[PDB]
């Protein structure tokens, strides 16, 4: 998953 779609990880 691209960083801007992942709410559970520091991008």
């Amino acid at each position, epitope marked *: 998953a691209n960083p*801007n779609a*992942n*709410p559970n990880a*520091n*991008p």
Partner: antibody
Amino acid sequence: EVQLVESGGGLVQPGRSLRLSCTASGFTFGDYAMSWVRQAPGKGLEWVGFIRSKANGGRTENPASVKGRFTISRDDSKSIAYLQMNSLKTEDTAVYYCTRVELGSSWSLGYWGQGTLVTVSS
Amino acid sequence: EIVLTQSPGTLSLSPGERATLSCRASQSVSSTYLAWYQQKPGQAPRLLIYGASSRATGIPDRFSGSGSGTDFTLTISRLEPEDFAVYYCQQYGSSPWTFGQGTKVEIKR
């Protein structure tokens, strides 16, 4: 028992500002990302953004439809997430749901509030 | 954006019957990133299935999910009166997060 209670909805003119609150209870609110979803009258669901937990940087993501107008914020000491809606458009008329983003690798929207109605009209 | 196309638009069925709902993604979506929600009349949506096949907390066994790539399916094995509702799929692996347009499960007469 997880509970999410939205408030702040109402009737507002286009171009005005309105802040929605989501009071969260029944879980460790500070550990979770939170997300707002909206439903226009007679229409389906549209994601309007999420905010990460503070440990994960506490920043937000929004789709182009509301980017630059809607800001999500959170007060973990009060267990409240916010949706600051600026430059409101008539098309923003919708029920706005606050949702908890599930932890782990599959970040579905595990819990939803009852929703608060925002009617943008001149 | 990934477009989720659900079919059929309306599923007209009786209690006790099996309901099969389809969600087609415009590109491949990891099964980890697909969910299904139920919205009963006048209520907020609730999570049913996450990661394509995992039931959410408190969701009865008659609800199941499967699929991968671009084709995803939600099955209700034996409809109960409370199951007549609108069902939405959702992907959260790509930004923006998107929802299907919804499938209505309507009581048949």
